[PDB]
Every structure is written in C-alpha cells, then in structure tokens.
Amino acid sequence: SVTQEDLKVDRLPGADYPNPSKKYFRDKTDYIMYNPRPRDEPSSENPVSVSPLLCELAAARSRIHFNPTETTIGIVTCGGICPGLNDVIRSITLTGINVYNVKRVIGFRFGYWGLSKKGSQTAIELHRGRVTNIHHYGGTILGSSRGPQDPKEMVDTLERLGVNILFTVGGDGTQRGALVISQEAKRRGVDISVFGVPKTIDNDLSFSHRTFGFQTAVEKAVQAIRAAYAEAVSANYGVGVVKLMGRDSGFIAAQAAVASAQANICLVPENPISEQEVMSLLERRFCHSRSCVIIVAEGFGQDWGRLIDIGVILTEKVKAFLKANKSRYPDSTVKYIDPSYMIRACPPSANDALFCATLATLAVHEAMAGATGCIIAMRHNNYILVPIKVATSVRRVLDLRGQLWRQVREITVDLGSDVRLARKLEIRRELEAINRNRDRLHEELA
Amino acid sequence: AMLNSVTQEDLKVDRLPGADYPNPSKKYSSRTEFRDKTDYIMYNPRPRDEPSSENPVSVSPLLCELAAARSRIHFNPTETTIGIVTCGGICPGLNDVIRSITLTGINVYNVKRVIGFRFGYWGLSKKGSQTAIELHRGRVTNIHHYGGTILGSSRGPQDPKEMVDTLERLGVNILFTVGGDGTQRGALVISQEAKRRGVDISVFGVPKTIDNDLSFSHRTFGFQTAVEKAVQAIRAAYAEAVSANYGVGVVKLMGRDSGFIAAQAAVASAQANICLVPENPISEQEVMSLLERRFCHSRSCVIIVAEGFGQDWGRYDASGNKKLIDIGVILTEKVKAFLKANKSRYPDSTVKYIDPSYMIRACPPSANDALFCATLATLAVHEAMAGATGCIIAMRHNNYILVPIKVATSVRRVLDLRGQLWRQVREITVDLGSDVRLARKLEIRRELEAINRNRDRLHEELAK
Amino acid sequence: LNSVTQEDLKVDRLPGADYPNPSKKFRDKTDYIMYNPRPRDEPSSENPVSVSPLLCELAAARSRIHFNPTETTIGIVTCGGICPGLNDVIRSITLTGINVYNVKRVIGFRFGYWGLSKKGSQTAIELHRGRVTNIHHYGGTILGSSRGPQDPKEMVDTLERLGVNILFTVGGDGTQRGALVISQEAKRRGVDISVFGVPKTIDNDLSFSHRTFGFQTAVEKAVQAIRAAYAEAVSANYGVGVVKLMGRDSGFIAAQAAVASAQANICLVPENPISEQEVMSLLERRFCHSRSCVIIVAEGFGQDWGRIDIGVILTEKVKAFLKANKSRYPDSTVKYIDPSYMIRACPPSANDALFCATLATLAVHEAMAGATGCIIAMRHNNYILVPIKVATSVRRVLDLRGQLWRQVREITVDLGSDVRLARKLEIRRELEAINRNRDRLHEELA
Amino acid sequence: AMLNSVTQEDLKVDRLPGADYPNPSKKFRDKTDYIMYNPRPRDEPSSENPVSVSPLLCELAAARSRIHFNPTETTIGIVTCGGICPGLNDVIRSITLTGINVYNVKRVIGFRFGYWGLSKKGSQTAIELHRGRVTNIHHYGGTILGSSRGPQDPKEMVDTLERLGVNILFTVGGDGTQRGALVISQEAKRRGVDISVFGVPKTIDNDLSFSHRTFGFQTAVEKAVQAIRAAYAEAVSANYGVGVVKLMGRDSGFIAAQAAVASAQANICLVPENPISEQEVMSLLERRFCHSRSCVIIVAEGFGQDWGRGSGGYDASGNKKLIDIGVILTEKVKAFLKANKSRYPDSTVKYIDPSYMIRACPPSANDALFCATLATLAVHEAMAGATGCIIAMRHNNYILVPIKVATSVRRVLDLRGQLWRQVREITVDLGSDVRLARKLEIRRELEAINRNRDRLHEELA
Ligand SMILES: O=C1N=CCc2c1ccn2Cc1ccc(Cl)c(Cl)c1
Ligand SMILES: O=C1N=CCc2c1ccn2Cc1ccc(Cl)c(Cl)c1
Ligand SMILES: O=C1N=CCc2c1ccn2Cc1ccc(Cl)c(Cl)c1
Ligand SMILES: O=C1N=CCc2c1ccn2Cc1ccc(Cl)c(Cl)c1
C-alpha cells in the first residue's frame, strides 16, 4: 500500500532564479497530514496522526527552476468536456503572462492529437486577448479528443516549439500519458516539466475531496431532477428515470438525490442490485404514491446487458414490468431524461470559477518551481501536490456506511419501513396542527 | 383545391340563454358610454387599397369577438361551481392557468366552489371522479412556481355520457378544458351532451399547445418559455460540438406538425447551421450536402430538428414494448453513417444527440408567460360567467378573442417559408447557393483590413 | 389623438432606387396595415371598414434599393441609459450590412452623439464580423453611450468626412429628435445620407408601437427584484418592502411586474397620482390582517411630493408613519430596493434577442431602400415604419380602465372593501377547507 | 503583543447527564471521536507518525448509539433570529424532518420572529411544524418562522419552553443569538429543567472561527458576482465610468474578496482588514483611468469606519451603527472627478447596493446539501444530549464547538494568504511603471496580431 516514498513529488534539478511575483515566499517544502485524526484520546502531549502519510502543500516558492522570460508554457485539454476547462486555460495563461512574464503560451488543439506532427500545425498562440472572456463559455477553445499519441512524436513537438512546461488537463488516462511524456523527456535529458490538472466531473480522484466542475455538475443534475419530477408527478403511476454521470462512482447521483429531495430510488455503481430489487422498490413506492423518480449512474447495472446504455435498458425494463402488471397499474407513463449534454457543457458556477483559477495559478507557481510528474489536488481545505503514479493507482468511491449515503437512504424507498404505521403518526401530527388553526380561527371572530 | 369555408356565422360564439345577474366586478355605471355588449376586431387588419379619401377596407370579411368582463352575467355567482381539467403533454404555465381560474372564480366572482378533475378526462369518469380535489385559496397559493399540473394529465377520451353524469352529480356549471385539438373536440362533445339533457353547463377551452400552431392565434401560453429553454439546449449542444474536430450536435426541439420553436430558437441562438422543420421536407441526401458544405470551412455543425420532420425517413424493443419513430435518433444514425463512409475527408468525427424535451415542457413559465397565463385564465372566467360556451380564448394582433371550437379544430398554423422568420433562418443556416471558395476569400480580406487598422493604431501609440 | 393625418405617417424616401437587391429567395411596392383594426359598423356580408383612416407602411426587404451596396458605409450610435439588447441591435445591423448587402464598411460612433463631434470622432471603431461575434451575450453597449446633444453641423461634418451613407440612431425620444435635425442638415447640403432610428425605451412608452426591445427582459428582472423584496418583508413582523421599478413617464414595467409576481400589495404609477395620505391608508388597510406589505413605485410617481428620488422619499415617509403609530405597529421594518442597475444592464431574454435581431435586420433592409427620418416599430404583430416627427409628438401611458390595470387592482389593497366583513368570509372559506381535511384524515385511521 | 488563549477545556462540549435510550435510527458511534484543530506536522517526514503543531482536538459530530432524550416524549423547538440568509428554510425543514422521520419525536414547534416568539406575548403565534408544513419551504428565501433582532427576558423565554414542554431549542442566528442561547441554557440549569440549547450558526460573511464554511456564504458569492457583472456593464458603457458596489462584509471581506476573484472584473477591492485612506483610493482610481475608461470598486460595509464619525448608537442586535460607506465613497469619488474635470471631462459614478438580492434568495444546490447536513447532525447530537454548543464545518468534517469559545474569536482575511494575493493580481497596483508596463502590453499584442496576419495570409489559395 501507499508509503511516504509514493507521495514524494519530483523536482527538476536546480532553482537558480528568484521569483518575480510581488511581496504585497516559501523557502522549503511544507506538509499537511493525509489523515488529521488522532491515534489516542486527548492527552497532555500533542496528538499523533492515525496515518504515517504527509502530503506536500502547493505554494509560490521564493526560488524557481525555469528562467521566466525564456520559458514557454504549453496546454492540452483531453477527453469529455467538463465545466471550467476554459477557466483553467485562462488562469494558466494569465498567471504565466501577468505574474511570471513568460516568453510564450501555446494551446495544443483536440487533446494529444495537437502534439502529433500533423496536429501541431493547428497549435494556437494564447495571449491576454485570446482568453479575456473564454471562462463565460462551456467546452474548451483548444478542443479535446480521446486516446493517445506516440510519446516520441509529442516530445519532438515540445522540443521543436521550445516548450519548457506542459499542463495536461484530463482524466486518469491523460495523466498516465503525461508521466510517459515526462520520462521520454528525462530519457533525452530535455528540461521539461509535465504537470497535471485533474479533470473528472465525478470527483473520484483519490488524495482529493473536490475536483473542478463537480459542484456545477450537481447544480445542473438537480435542475434535471426538478424537470423529471414535474413530468412524473403529472402522470397517474408516472416514472421519471434520469441518468446522472457516474462512470465508476455515484458522487453526482448521491449529492443530487439529497440536494433535490425528489429521488425515490438512487442507483450507483458502488451498490449493484438486481432488476427484481429495483422493481420491488418501485412496487413499494406505488403502494402509497402515484409517481416515482429514479436516479441512475451510467456505471450502474453493467451486468444487466449481454458501456451498455443503462438509462435506456432501465426505462425499457420498468415499462415491461408495468405492462406485465397493467392489472394493478392500469395506466402508467415512463419518461427517460439524459441531461448529460447540459451537465458537462455549461460554464462553471462562481464557486467553481474561483476553484479553477486557484488550481491553475498554484499549478503554474509549482511547475515554475520545477514540480513535474504530479497533479494539483484539494484535500482538507488545502492545495497539495500528488505524484501521477500513486494518483492513477487508486480511485475514490461512495462509502455505503458514510453520512452522504445515509441521507440518500433516509429519502429513498426502504422495504424495511412500516409505511402504513409511519402514516398513522403523520396523520396525528397533521390533526394536531389543523386543530390549533381551527381554534385560532374560531377565536379571531369577535 | 380544398379551401376552408369559414363565414362570419362560423365565428359567432354560443351564449347560454339569459344574462339575468349584474357583474359584481364590472358595474355598467363605471363605463363612460352606453351598450355593454359584443365588440369586434378584424381577422386581417391589412387594407384592400392604397391610402385614399375613404377609410380602408379589410382584405378579409371576418370579424372576431373580443374577450372582456361583461356588465351582465348568465351564472348567479354564489350558486356557481367551476370545474377544471388538464389533458395531454404538460406545458409551462398549466399551474398558472389552474391558479388564475381558481382565484378569479373565488376572489372576483365569489363562486360557491372550484373542483380540479385529475389526470385529464379520466378524472370525470365514474371511477376517476373519486380522486377530484377541492381548489381553495390554500391549495393554489404557490403552484405557479412549479412545472407540470397539480391536477395531473392523461391522453385520450372518456364516455361523454359518464362525464356529464359526473358534472351533473357535482353540480358543475362551468368546465374549463385545458388541452390541445383532441381535448377541445371532446369539450364540444361534452357541451352537446349537456345541451341534449338541457343541463345549464358552459364548456370553455384554454388552448394548450407549446408549438403555437393554434389558428386564429399568434401566441399560446408556454411557447415563449419553450423558446428560452430551446436556446439553452442549443448553447450546450454548440459547446459540445465546437469542442470536437468535425463535431456535430443534433438537438430535437418539439415541433410535432410545425417548426415555430425550432425556427425562433435557431434565430435567437444564432448557433444553428441546419434547421429541419415539417413545413420544409428535404431528403437525407440534401441534409448530408448541407453538412458537407458546413465542413468545407468549419470544424463543427449544429443541427436543429423538429420531431415532425422527415416522417417519410426509414420505415418491438428487447422488453417487448412497441418502438415509436424518433427522427432525432434516425438523423443522428444517418449523420454517423455519412461521416463513417467519408472517414477519408472527416478523419475523426463526433456526433452527439440531445433531447431536451423534458426540460423544455416541464419548467415553470417565464414572467412574461406567467402574465399571459393569468390574463387568458381571468378573461376565460369573465366570458364563461357571461355564458360563453363551445369556444376557446386566443390572442391575435395584440388582443384577446373568443373562437368557436368547431372552427378552431378545423384548421392549424404552419411556418410560411416565404415569411421574415424563415428568411432569418436562411440567412444564418448553410446555403448551397453560395460560392464556398469565393465567399471565403472576401471573408479573409475583411478580417485582414480590420487587423491592419489595429496594427497601425498600436504602432502609433508607442513612439507617441 | 383626435388629430394625426395620413400625411403625418408618410415615410420619406431618398430619391431613386437604381440598384437590384443582392439578397435572394421581395416587395416591388409599399404595403400597409390599419392603425386601428376595429370595424366602424356591426358585422355584415361586406368586408369591414376601419374606425380610423390611418394606414402604417409595413417594413420589408425591397426588390429595388437606393444605395449601391459595395459603395455604402453604415454608421451606428447608441445614446442615453443602457437597455437590454443594445449589443444585439449593434450586432444585427453590422451582420445584415456585411453578410446580406456586402456593404463597404460599418462604423461604431462611441459614447452617443459625442462620438460624431470633431473631438469624439477620433474614437470611432471599425465594426467587422470579428468585433461583434459574441457581444449580444453581454449587457451595456460596446460603443458606449452618453446623454445630451452635439452641434448638428459638426456631426454632418463627421458623416461627410467618413463617407457615411446610413446612420442608425439607437436611443429615446430626445435622440430621434436629434436624428431628424441631422437628416435635415444633410438634405440642406444635398448629402446622400439616410438617418434611421431604432427606438430604445425600456418603458415601452413609444406610440405607434405595442413593444420596444428590452422591455420584456426588464419585466423578468423586475419580478426577480419583487421576489427578493417579498422574502425580506414576509420575514419581519410589520415588514415593508419598497421597490422602485423604472417608469419615468409611464408604469408598464411596474404594472406587468405587479401582475406577473402576484406579490405587490400597492402599485404606484405616474398615470395614477395619489397623495402620501392615500398611500399610508393603503398600508394601514394591508396591516389590518397581514404582517407584511410590498410597495412597487415607478420613478415618475409622486413628482408633486417634493416642495426627486421618490424611492428614498417614499421609504422615509413610510418609516415616519410607522414610527408615529408605534402604538399599533410595535416593531416594524422598512427596506428600500433599487434594482435599476440589474434591470437595465443584463443581456436580453431569448425572446428579446429574436426581437432585437428582427428590428435591426428590417431597419437595414428599409434604409438600403432609401427610408430616412423614420423609426422601425412593432404594432399588431407587424413591423412598421413611422416618421420621427409624429413618433416624438405623442407618448404611450397605462389605460386605468384597461384589463392590465384591472388585474393590478384585483391583487392590490382596496379601500372600497369592508375590512371586517371581507375577513369573516375569508375565515369561513378556510374553515370549510380544513374541516374537509380533518374528516378525510380521521377516516384514514382504520 | 497579545495572543488568544484557547485550551482543550475551551473545546469540551457540555452533555446533559445520562444517555439511557437506544438510537432508533438503523443501517452508530459508542464514544466521542476527535479531529486535529491543525493537521500540519511539527517535524519533517520520519519513521514515526507525524505530530500536530497544535495540542487542540475538536469533537466530531455524528449519530450516537445511546441518546439522552426519550424520542417519543421529546419536543423540539426552532427559532430564526437576525438578518435573513440563504438556506434558513433548509435548516428549519431538515431539523423538522430529522426529528419526525429519524427519531419520531412527539412534536416540533416553530417560534416566530426570533426570540420575540418565545416571549409571553409572542408565544401565542408559535406554529406546529409537521411534514406537510415544511415540504417545499426550502425553494424560497427568508424564513417561514420570521426573524427579529435583539434579546428578550430569559425568564419569560424559559417560562414558554417549560409551558410547551420543549426539550431541545435550536437557535439559528449570529454571535448575538448564540450568546442569548447560552443565557437561556443557564436559566434552565438554574431551575433544574432538562433542556438542550443547540446553535446552527447563521453568518453570510463566513467569519465564524473553528470553521471554513457557514451556510448561505457560497450562494452570497454567486449573487455578488451577478451584481458585479451588472455594475461592469454600466461602468464600461460610460466614458470614465465608475461602478461602486457594496458587498456585505460587516467585520471581514470574504464575500468581497471571493466575488472580486470569481468575477475578475473588480479594479479596487476595499475590505475592513485593509483600511486605506480616501487619498490612496483616489490614487488607485487615477492609475486605473491612465489606460482604461472604466473602473469597478467593491466595498465591504465595514470598510472605512474611520472615514466619518457615526452616531455612537447600537442597532436592535447590539451592533455599532455603521456610517454608510457605500454612499460616502460614491460621494467622494464624484467630488474627486469633479475637482479633476480637466482630465476626466465627462464622468459617471453609479452606486449599487445588491444586499437585498444577496441575502433573500433560496440557496444554491451545494448550500441546500450543506444546510441539510448541518441540521441533521445538529438533531443527532442534541438528541445525544449536546448543549451550549454550535455545529461547524472544518477540514471537510463536521465538529461541535462550545458557544463560549465560538463567540470569543472571529475570522478575518489573511492579507498574506493566497485569496488576497489573487485579489492583488487583478486589482490596480501603484507599484507598476504605468509607461513601461504599457509598452510591454503593446509589444505582446503586436506579436499576436502579426501571427494572426500570417496564418490569414497563408489560408488564401
Ligand atoms: O482506472 C481508473 N478508472 C477511473 C478513475 C480512476 C482510475 C485510476 C484513478 N482514477 C481516479 C482519477 C480520476 C481523474 C484523474 Cl485526472 C486521476 Cl489522475 C485519477
Ligand atoms: O393535427 C394537428 N396538429 C397540430 C395542430 C392542430 C391539429 C389540428 C388542429 N390543430 C390546431 C389546434 C391546436 C391546438 C388547439 Cl387547442 C386547437 Cl383547438 C387547434
Ligand atoms: O417626453 C417623453 N417622455 C416619454 C416618452 C416620450 C416622450 C416624447 C415622445 N415619447 C415617446 C417615445 C419614446 C421613445 C422613443 Cl425612441 C420615441 Cl421616438 C418616442
Ligand atoms: O463580535 C463579533 N462580531 C462578528 C463576528 C463574531 C463576533 C464574535 C464571534 N464572531 C464570529 C461568529 C459569527 C457567527 C456566529 Cl453564530 C458565532 Cl457563534 C461566531
């Protein structure tokens, strides 16, 4: 498992230049505890971490590795779009130009394709004028693509254009590629930093509590649920099925379910249940209600097909179930909602705009200080550096015993509950309230 | 050729016999002139002739009756029961119409009682009538802040005999039918079953069509909200498409039998390169030719498609359910097949399909639709209390009018491909008539002229 | 008015239409719409006759145009307070000129009429496709705006010097009066210039008009301001929210916002001047059986209240009234909200974006066809041309006997009601409802 | 110099005696668990686990296996006090639904218009909170209970609590409200009555200590950025246009600072932590107008309290009556521009107070989730006999803090920290050479337009 060695961040040799940024900084590496929980009860001596692990904190350094005015920064965006890609491009560019006064900033187009011999022709000049308002729009002005290119070709491009720092904005696959580029550079003894800004709307990066665009995604997911609910509650035995991202984890689905308070069933990859259990939950909902809203992560029920499109398959199976039971559900309506387009393709919330700008600015500070083969992450309210190797070796998933999942279980259908009993206590509370109103009203006359 | 045969007689709206009660909100003595009765607006306000010494004459002989609070009413307010039913697909502002019908009845006319029938015409059947809800001030206070209908909705008819049985049993004097063409045809059948038994009932339609394809009408409620939501869907499709090399966003924008949402959204957004509407059937080959032309000098394309486009395109799912036609899916598949067959010229390509139907129809209305819904509903109550029946309320040439259901359900509204809206769609969308290579040369000259000017002023600013 | 003749509605054309219209599949002669589409007589077998003799010229693309497209220079100026959609009008004028007519050049004059003065003309900007691409996503004007006039002689000097053939004047009544003075100075020197107004009034108080651009957006924002005022007021014991909602000379925004929101208890508009004492009487009546009150006030209300900022003065007078009556209103809270900034400075709704684009496109079509000394307006669902002289001679105001104002009176406090009686009926209706619920609940047990 | 003294004793949260009942919630904690106040190590990485720089441990909030109150005999009371804040209705809803749905408590009472609602007169207005009364209240700004500023007689209030059989009172409000909560707690202890008083902190300014985030703060920053966007549109539309926008910030500038960075459209950001003179402000404006025709100024309501003398008075909540710095700043900017009409021949200054729209909206979805989680854990811990404390969020975890220490210290911007550095990167800097900085600007632009000019020239043929 993970050792302190696994958390040591690579530095390019030498920090020969002063940091030009203004004293309105750090001379040594500071650390934060991976786990800030104590081993023992309160005692007369300072508490000791349950874990041996320390993470390096990200910050502007007093000494830097790259000579600012000779430095070329490169940027590439890869994979599915995510709210705040333009914020990361803008803030990397403006930190480079305004704070370090770097020679040049290059935007490589359509992911790693943009660093291939063919693709490198399309590379764009990122100046102040080119990034002024790009953060008001979803997508990426650079464009994106999936899948790799020859690392040899890509380092050929980097050398040819005199790129000293490449920022890799993308998911697990992109950062694995970043580490391969880093090592091809080291192999030829070229002075290049490769520095990852993690892109995962699902917030399933480890050594991390929050990735950029996640909070925006939850806002949009709740708006999709509000529409699904309006549709479902408008029909007799109405069912709204809404797919909410979640390739390998259910953080968006779980947070949206709790925030909206309108989901009756929440289906996540961490909690695989059968078609039969799902229909049993729907059956229980329809005992006391005329509508049901089902949230489903795209990674749920991958053992339900021969990704399979679980949104379509679930909708089809719910229809088949209700048709086979037309006896008890005489008329019924099942609506499928795929809001994926609207969740990923918007500009960020103001809180994600600030987060994106802070990730990007610290990524420039640390790369200028010779950090390489690492990502910037946010953990316990602090910015840290994590080596790509350990970051891509583990992933984050819902704890089904944790407080978030407990809140999902409190609002969603539970076969264990005495619905009909609970209703009797409900009616007593209501009667108490309307009796009080009845009295005050009777009083008010005369 | 088949022409519609509408005469002035066809536009006369039925009144229940007698207006024996004074209006408690419209006192005859608060008029400034005599004769509180029916005023008219011209169907077509365009003249036959040039300006001359005599007043201009309408190109049409038709006059529409204007909707308004009357000084004399047919129903005795405190003995009056109002019923409401919502039918078919939901539409932004259903709750606004329910709320405003209820509060006009209670607050303005002080009616005895308001009943909400549930899940469309099902709610007036013998079985369904058990579910009927009491609409008081407390039940409707904030319902206009939410999409859908608190009454619920369903498609398709019920036995008119059963439904009039329900209306008689509950003592319903006015039934408001909120729904489309099919719903209002049913309203007229209810009206006639009532007349047959000599029961004193007004049936009054509030038209529900998100597509704005009601005739004798320029605007139906929820349409403007739908266009707002359609433009937000297009903004997301564009962000996705422009982020890919040879990226295509296909977005379906309502439009069952007409393309008003698709056309207005295309022009409002200024981001659609192809706009496919039922009024303008073109072949799969013409569509791919437009995409091909777009990809000559761009790396992305956004395609708007109405659900009623290409019904002559193409011809049970795994669970044994019947598969609907879906031009959105079929178009997306055909665009992929075209790009795959031409991977030579479009080496990598991405096609994304977006169905924002859920978000377009299921939201609360814009403030402008909230006002419109409240005004339609309040005037519908005023006119039904004044004994109007077998008719709908519509908005035409900035005015509220009454139209008999028979006329209203005999004709539908469609884009004029020679009109100004469609011209604006053609100005923004790909045009095969342009010289690809020439047009591009002039583009670059204009750009070069601009950056040359900036380059000069910048050079000036230094040594100054 | 009882006056206004067909002559007053005749729109000036520059002499000659010697060029074909380069747009493709247009009108060969001028078509008309009736000013008043109401009939003189009862329905009869013969086509109805207008109550009015007046006909308005319809706006449309013409087959013959006055200006030679490739020799034509278009100028644009934006004047007075900003209004949602200014950038939409600038963009659509520019792109219609360039993309449809392929005009030589488009000039943006800066900070209103100042921009056409000898000093100001140096700041004039080149409007090409690149300069207007996304400007419609932002509030304000890229050209900038200013109030008040310049020397017409100087301005025509500028127009002649820059070879401007069509000047579009985007502004209110004062701006268009200036446009007509420019037009006549041009005619006097025999310079071939069209001056064509796009009316800018957030208040929608242009005559020969049912809707001006930005009005609908303003009502959306006004309703959002009222929603916040209501939340504040209803949260306090004897809470009062006063919100000022534009309305310099008319109350269309205030009236539509009051009805759309359904949360205003008092609506104060210039058309209905009432005394300080009547206002306090309405508040007094509201506080008989409610603990909160929301007051909408147009900026043009109560200009006979000073021996003036009516928002501040009204708020002060409401506080003085509540303080003098602290006996009956023991603790009380008065909040003033001026949302003017947020109402005028936003981008338009999608419906206003479409309207702006349509006004602007037709304005270019008609100016290219030699229309001058006129504005484009929308009336009875149609686009018309109106001479500036008649357009600036009359203004539009609320009809206090109309359906809109009736809806305002239905929701706002009414002194005409019996306080005591009205309340008794209220309580009976409530008791009826809660008695039914009380029964069904009692039933449901067993 | 003067340092704060916080000890482990100050962080020990009071428990009512006895936990005699099992927790009816189903599929937790059998003893009190802790998190480090400061998770930074004393030493370099070594063979031994790292040791905290601080001796302080905070008690973690959680559902307990043993509870103090017998659920079906328990009455929960709720009161909302002071200025409204996005998410008040979310806290009321979640306290109510946790009480009813999880613990099946006897009864939930909503006291109206703050502490007034627990007075003899006010207690008549108290409302019954059931599932039906709170179903959608979280979709609206304000409080369905209503709010008021300032105190009531503690004797009267405990009279009300005893009369209605209230076992737990939740106090939703600021520093002043929670000081009142402690006074209620002690009046109860004095009479030996079994009551828990448990605070949910309400501060839009996020200036609670032992805390990184209070509810409604993130929503406030969203609304502040919308206000700045409108101010910018107005200012950039005028020749020498100035938008002055006031952004909350009574004693700290977290809203102003985060809004300035999020918007990237503020040229000057004025916060209580950084008092500067009228002359320095006008110097920053002067520098902005050297190479721009517009300026946006953010000002916290607590900035420049040494720019005038106030009345000496106190508002109903017992806070200083502040001078209106928004109006005074706007007036001084106008006076400066008028006195310099020579160099700023026409100028326009607009003042924007968006306070109404910032505090009176429903929460963002992220604030709705936060509010629900604070409220649910507050019920869990009060049922487990926690009293005289608040629930707070720190280092991504929920903790309990005694009111006494929570009301003794407040949180303020670090002018040497990363947030304020980002504010300084975007706002006007007198330290730059105006003339030199401009020359380099133009060179970079010329380089860019030369590249575009080339690619365009290429593209023909
Ligand atoms: O194999 C994986 N599949 C999914 C997710 C995953 C994996 C490894 C790490 N992670 C989490 C992760 C997500 C994004 C980034 Cl940028 C990184 Cl470096 C790791
Ligand atoms: O088949 C149709 N498809 C669309 C529209 C349509 C049809 C028939 C009449 N009409 C027009 C219409 C639409 C709505 C209503 Cl409520 C009415 Cl009465 C007619
Ligand atoms: O003095 C006026 N106050 C308000 C309205 C008004 C006046 C004069 C004409 N009008 C109508 C009007 C409004 C805007 C425009 Cl652009 C025009 Cl041309 C006329
Ligand atoms: O006197 C203060 N003025 C402002 C802020 C402050 C004070 C004391 C503690 N605090 C921080 C604080 C804020 C809110 C709450 Cl609910 C609490 Cl308990 C403390």
Residue numbers in the entry:
A (entry chain C): 23 to 46, 52 to 333, 346 to 485
B (entry chain A): 19 to 333, 338 to 486
C (entry chain B): 21 to 45, 52 to 333, 347 to 485
D (entry chain D): 19 to 45, 52 to 485
Sentences from the study reporting this entry:
In this stage of its life cycle, the parasite mitochondrion is highly compromised and cannot carry out oxidative phosphorylation and T. brucei exclusively uses glycolysis as the sole source of ATP. Trypanosomatid PFKs have been characterised by X-ray crystallography and two conformational states have been identified that fit with a classical description of an allosteric enzyme that transitions from an inactive T-state conformation to an active R-state conformation. Comparison of the T-state and R-state structures show that activation of TbPFK requires a large movement of the critical catalytic residues Asp229 and Asp231. The carboxyl groups of the two Asp residues hydrogen bond with the F6P substrate and also coordinate a catalytic magnesium ion, facilitating transfer of a phosphoryl group from ATP.
Based on the X-ray structure of CTCB-12, a number of derivatives were synthesised using pyrazole and bicyclic scaffolds, including imidazopyridines, pyrazolopyridines, thienopyridines and pyrrolopyridines, and tested against an enzyme inhibition assay and an in vitro parasite killing assay. Over 30 X-ray structures of TbPFK complexed with ligands from most of the different scaffold families have been determined, and all show the conserved binding of the dichlorophenyl group locked in the allosteric pocket as observed in the structure with CTCB-12. The X-ray complexes clearly explain the SAR that strictly limits the size of substituents on the phenyl ring. Chlorine in the meta position is ideally positioned to make a specific electrostatic interaction with a carbonyl oxygen of Gly197 lining the allosteric pocket. The geometry of this ‘halogen bond’ with a Cl…O distance of 3.3 Å and C–Cl–O angle of 150° is in the expected range. The mode of action for the CTCB family of inhibitors is to lock the tetramer in the inactive T-state, with the activation loop held remote from the substrate molecules.
